[PDB]
Design a binder for this molecule. Structure first.
Ligand SMILES: O=c1ccn([C@@H]2O[C@H](COP(=O)(O)OP(=O)(O)O)[C@@H](O)[C@H]2O)c(=O)[nH]1
Ligand SMILES: O[C@H]1[C@H](O)[C@@H](O)CN2CC[C@H](O)[C@H]12
Ligand SMILES: [Ca+2]
Ligand SMILES: [Ca+2]
Ligand SMILES: [Ca+2]
Length: 539
């Protein structure tokens, strides 16, 4: 898997009596100078491979019938192989920063209890729980608007409950039309306030608006802010509103779009996490992840043949929490179904262990290449719930570029659509038609997945987020990397290629109570039925 010589390339691409074209010399010259760059940095080496790939298909484009072409297509696959070799040979320990994010409301104790597990076992990591001191009321604002929209939609359904098809589908359709109006009424208010007074603070804009439009109590909202601030402060809180240099101005603008306009705290955290990893370096984790387990801990308890690998991983964390009680309240529903004898196998192994680092596996030195961002996998697909990146890595810039290029397309078409539209439905049709008019083979799936952006958080089965700030931006970056592109949207990378970037498996437990619970946000008919029930169950 060493990269072919200039001389070896001449052998592959040989055509008897054929003139050496300028475009072909160019490739050979360039490949020679690559092999002369052993002292160069890995990024520099990667950039040279990249210049070489571009020279190659300049030849392939200029001479489409050439007999060199079969060999030159092979060579391009060899260049891609060479990226992996550089990557595997350029590993170095990440900065020992451990990042979490909680924005738009008060951090729960459940989040704090999981975070502490990582804190206790990683003394040599700096734990930073990122928050936004301007924005403790995002969830309050959203919940208020949504509540108001739900209640209005039920009043329009009051005489049509028992029949025929005033059902969950119609509910969400009509409620969303109301949400849109209420949400745009806020955004317009916020936008005008920010024009008038650009020093103005988000939470202050929000309390004024809730106070005036939704009769909310100023005192109560002020109190909530104080409690939220006090709570994160006592828990390694890092205010993003202190930090100076991290702020790419375009990314900042996307962060506040997601935070203040769209109320999508997941997307805002998607944007924030990669930005902090580029600026700080380290390991990013969602607050629902737990440390890996020491491999040897339960190594001698054989899994009952009937139980799945997934259930068994789940059972192991539950055994830890039953007998050590590190997170109080942690479920034991699965663990309690095992035969008495197996429960005691777990109990005994947990008996002889004194400290938490004999139970959980500390991160210690994690090695990573400047060319990559490591990522967690769930179900054969990447998931950005855990990430690893050196400060200022090449691949962190690929991810950030993907986010910006995607949002650009979203905004350039969505902003005019919002401006021309008397309502949700007219805006949507306008937006969809605009997307249709510029769609092609490469961006068609992306265009399809971002069409329902305005419904994100308010309706079921929406996948816009994944394809703007989530998992899709990572597969796009990895394809950019391997294929020497900067625009990947149509993905041909398979799982085994994507596995080259997986987060070290022993160093994370993804199958926690909170995450499994969060995997259930499948359709909630129940919600439309529970909202329904909350109209006979009162005074
Ligand atoms: O109110 C919220 C909700 C989510 N998040 C961030 O979004 C991450 C992922 O959210 P969640 O696990 O609920 O999303 P899901 O995994 O279901 O896509 C969390 O760890 C937080 O960093 C946040 O800051 N505030
Ligand atoms: O914030 C992330 C979360 O960290 C991951 O589990 C992937 N989720 C998919 C949708 C959104 O991107 C969200
Ligand atoms: Ca009072
Ligand atoms: Ca730093
Ligand atoms: Ca989750």
């Amino acid at each position: 898997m060493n990269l072919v010589n200039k001389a070896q390339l001449q052998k592959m691409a040989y055509v008897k009596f054929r003139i050496q074209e300028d475009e072909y010399v160019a490739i050979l010259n360039a490949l020679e100078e690559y092999h002369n760059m052993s002292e160069s940095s890995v990024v520099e080496k990667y950039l040279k491979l990249k210049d070489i790939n571009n020279l190659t298909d300049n030849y392939l484009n200029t001479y489409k019938k050439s007999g060199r072409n079969k060999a030159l297509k092979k060579f391009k696959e060899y260049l891609t192989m060479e990226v992996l070799e550089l990557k595997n040979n350029s590993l170095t320990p990440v900065e020992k920063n451990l990042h979490f994010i909680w924005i738009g409301g008060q951090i729960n104790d459940t989040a704090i209890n999981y975070i502490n597990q990582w804190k206790d076992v990683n003394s040599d990591y700096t734990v930073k729980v990122f928050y936004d001191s301007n924005a403790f009321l995002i969830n309050t604002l959203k919940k208020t608007i949504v509540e108001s929209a739900t209640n209005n939609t039920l009043e329009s359904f009051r005489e049509n409950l028992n029949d025929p098809e005033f059902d969950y589908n119609k509910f969400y359709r009509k409620r969303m039309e109301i949400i849109y109006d209420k949400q745009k009424h806020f955004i317009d208010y916020y936008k005008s306030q920010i024009e008038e007074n650009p020093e103005f603070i988000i939470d202050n804009i929000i309390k004024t608006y809730l106070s005036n439009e939704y009769s909310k109590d100023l005192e109560a909202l002020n109190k909530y802010i104080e409690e939220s601030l006090n709570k994160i402060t006592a828990n390694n809180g890092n205010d993003i509103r202190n930090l100076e240099k991290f702020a790419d101005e375009d990314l900042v603008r996307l962060y506040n779009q997601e935070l203040v306009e769209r109320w999508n705290l997941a997307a805002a955290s998607d944007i924030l996490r990669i930005s902090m990893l580029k600026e700080d370096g380290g390991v990013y984790l969602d607050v629902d992840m737990l440390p890996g387990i020491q491999p040897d801990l339960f190594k001698s308890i054989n899994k009952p043949d009937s139980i799945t690998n997934t259930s068994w991983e789940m059972i192991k964390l539950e055994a830890i929490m039953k007998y050590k009680e590190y997170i109080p309240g942690y479920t034991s529903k699965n663990f309690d179904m095992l035969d008495e004898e197996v429960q005691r196998s777990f109990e005994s192994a947990l008996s002889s262990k004194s400290d938490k680092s004999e139970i959980f596996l500390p991160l210690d030195d994690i090695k990573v290449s400047p060319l990559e961002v490591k990522i967690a996998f769930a179900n054969n697909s990447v998931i950005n719930q855990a990430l690893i990146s050196l400060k200022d890595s090449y691949c962190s810039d690929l991810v950030i570029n993907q986010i910006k290029n995607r949002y650009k397309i979203l905004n350039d078409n969505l902003n005019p659509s919002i401006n021309e539209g008397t309502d949700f439905n007219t805006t949507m049709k306008i937006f969809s038609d605009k997307l249709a008019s510029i769609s092609n083979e490469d961006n068609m799936m992306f265009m399809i997945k971002i069409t329902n952006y305005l419904k994100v958080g308010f309706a079921p089965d929406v996948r816009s987020t994944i394809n703007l700030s989530g998992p899709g931006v990572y597969t796009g970056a990895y394809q950019d990397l391997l294929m020497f592109k900067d625009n990947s949207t149509n993905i041909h990378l398979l799982e085994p290629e994507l596995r080259n970037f997986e987060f070290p498996k022993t160093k994370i437990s993804q199958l926690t109570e909170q995450e499994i619970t969060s995997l259930w946000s499948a359709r909630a008919k129940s919600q439309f039925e529970e909202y329904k029930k909350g109209y006979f169950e009162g005074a």
